[PDB]
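yo, histone deacetylase 7 is done. seq:
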Amino acid sequence: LPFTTGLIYDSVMLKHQCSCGDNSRHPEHAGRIQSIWSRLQERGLRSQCECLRGRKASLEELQSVHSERHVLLYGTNPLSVMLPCGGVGVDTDTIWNELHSSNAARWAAGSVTDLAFKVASRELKNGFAVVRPPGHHADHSTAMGFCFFNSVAIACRQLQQQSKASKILIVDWDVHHGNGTQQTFYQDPSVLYISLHRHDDGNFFPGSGAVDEVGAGSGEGFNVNVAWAGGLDPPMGDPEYLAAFRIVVMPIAREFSPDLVLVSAGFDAAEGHPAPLGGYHVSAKCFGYMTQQLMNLAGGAVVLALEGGHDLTAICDASEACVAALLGNRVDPLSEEGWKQKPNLNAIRSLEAVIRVHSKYWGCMQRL
Ligand SMILES: CN1CCC(CNC(=O)c2cccc(-c3noc(C(F)(F)F)n3)c2)(c2nc(-c3ccccc3)cs2)CC1
Ligand SMILES: [K+]
Ligand SMILES: [K+]
Ligand SMILES: [Zn+2]
Ligand SMILES: [Zn+2]
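structure:
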């Protein structure tokens, strides 16, 4: 393998679909990764990477994060809940194809893990995993919010257990809180979880991720929720997310000083997601710039994994900008008016609350 960025993709993950067929009623659809994949080729980025198929996560790998009941239920074939549309699912949004969902879920976990390992060995510089279904809502014994196995969490646990990375930063910029990821690593100080999400007083899915939630035991202070409050007006976008990176994410990340960075890279904070899917206005350029900023950490050992994002062009724009950043292309911050705008008052109060809480734990948060 050459020292460039790696891309993970495989058609096996397309097969995760409800039997009723309707991609509108079930918006977490195959087209999401399919369109990103062809977009990377159309724009000439795909051929510059090393393209990898990935693999099934083993039952053992799944059990490093999930319970035995959970893994039997979603990880294995029966032989070895009803929905309004007639298909089967765990709940109304989280569907279950009785032939393919388990396979596709295990592939997503397995492939994010395989990519992280290749990056951790410096066999690959960095990587982007174009996977579905998403993972960050799946917790120890609950599939929910379109998620079955927490691929990023499973990848992180394996890197640790195989001794391939001492300290791991997990950044989650999907607009929803990664409740699963927070839970798994809540008491482990060798994993730093930083989420930027729409919180709005706990009235936005999943409802978790309050600024107060800092971790526990040895892991106190190693869970950082940039929980945006105040709602959609004034608009939430680049000024606020750039501000979050300048003030919270990067300084804490640098103080932590990880050996590898994992990114739960959802693109549902992007333009084209209305309320109540997202309602935020983060541009593709900003996503690629955030990737570029995370590439300064951990000797450039960075792995992104697709979580959420529905609007096809928006998630294609963003994914394109992240891969370009991974390949070394740089974003000039002076090339965009609007990045000159101060962040809105809701974002400033949100960050102010994050700083008040985490000044107990981090020197870079301890002001006068
Ligand atoms: C149809 N009806 C009204 C529209 C509906 C609203 N969604 C939610 O309320 C909702 C609830 C739980 C979880 C999530 C969610 N969004 O991203 C993620 C992920 F895990 F990050 F990928 N989870 C979203 C939509 N969901 C999506 C969607 C598309 C791709 C991935 C996830 C959700 C588009 S519209 C679902 C229920
Ligand atoms: K998040
Ligand atoms: K932690
Ligand atoms: Zn259906
Ligand atoms: Zn999301």
